[model samples]
Target: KETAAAKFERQHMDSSTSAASSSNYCNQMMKSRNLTKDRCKPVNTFVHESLADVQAVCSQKNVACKNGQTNCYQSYSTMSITDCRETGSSKYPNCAYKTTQANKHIIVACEGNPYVPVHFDASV
Candidate 1:
């Protein structure tokens, strides 16, 4: 059984190709803003896309669900899943209508100071 962090790290390592694209995007965004360091805000921008791809890859590992009611477990090592419910925000109703399967959410730390959101896939 792999730990959530370990699983995320393994998945991230396998998704380095996607991560590179995100890193490049973040770099460009920073350059356009005359920023020198990678910040959370800029990283968050790339994180959105990176996470999408991560989810897609994870789905290939049998984690995708058309609706929120499917009893999808996190990983075979982790047995957890909360009820999916409406988050209330109109923009992301689907996200709100979901629950976590792991006790601790995956945290994608940045490579630099003020660690920005390089990537994160809390939903699984």
Candidate 2:
């Protein structure tokens, strides 16, 4: 079984950033990465920063998750991230997304023995 940590890595970690700045980037990635297998995920973020840099957010100041959970932490420094937002006309099976690059303080949910990031809560 894929642990939450592994799944998070698969979905969000992309150190090798194409940064192509093409309209087709997210459209291709969302499908190539298999995120559109079943349905389009509403909103997701992929970090262009190193795994260690991102994981370090776990030890940063704590914050509240969008879900009202108290297991969130925010990054001290602005991190490079790609936000995949679904298009207004996007629908299931043929999901479409808008890829926007931004530098923001990422908020993440942490857990596990070493207390690393398990989920990407949001980017502020």
Candidate 3:
């Protein structure tokens, strides 16, 4: 069974693909990562940093998640990431996205015994 930590990695991690072309990154990634299956993921962010650094965020300062969850933590160091947002004309089964890459501090919801990220909350 896939744990929440594994699920988060599948949907958000891209440490080695930092050089992926931005022109059609989201278009290709969203599908290849299986995020465009049943329906287009409205918005998604892929972090382009070492997995260890990302997981280390769980030990940083706590913050509130979008849903007001108190388990969220913000990273101490800014990270490179690509934000993929569904285009205005994007539709289910034929999802399209616009990619915007940036360097910013990330916020994620963490959980479990190992205290790993389970949900990508936001980036600041």
Best by TM-score: 3
Candidates' C-alpha lDDT: 0.29, 0.79, 0.82
* Pairwise lDDT winner, candidates 2 and 3: 3
Angstrom error at residue 68, model 1? 27
User: Tens digits of per-residue lDDT for model 3 on 1-124?
Assistant: 4568887887888887773467668877888777787888898888887667778998988899888889889988888888998886679777888988888899988988677888788999
TM-score of each: 0.19, 0.85, 0.89
Error of 2 at 55 (Å): 1.1
| Worst-scoring 10-residue span by lDDT in model 2 | 18-27
User: 1 or 3: which has the higher lDDT?
Assistant: 3
* Quality of model 1 by C-alpha lDDT: 0.29
The TM-score between candidate 1 and the true structure equals: 0.19
Clashing pairs in 2: none
- In model 3, which runs have C-alpha deviations exceeding 4 angstroms? none
Superposition TM-score, candidate 3 onto the true structure: 0.89
Model 1 C-alpha lDDT per residue in residues 1-124, reported as the tens digit of each score: 4344343332233222323233123323323322222322212222223334333333333332334323222333321212222234413111222222222223233222322223234442
RMSD of each: 15.5, 2.1, 1.7
Residue 102's C-alpha lDDT in candidate 2? 83
Clashes of 1: 3
What is the overall TM-score of model 2 with all chains considered together? Answer: 0.85
Give the distance in Å from residue 19's predicted Cα in candidate 3 to where it truly belongs: 5.3
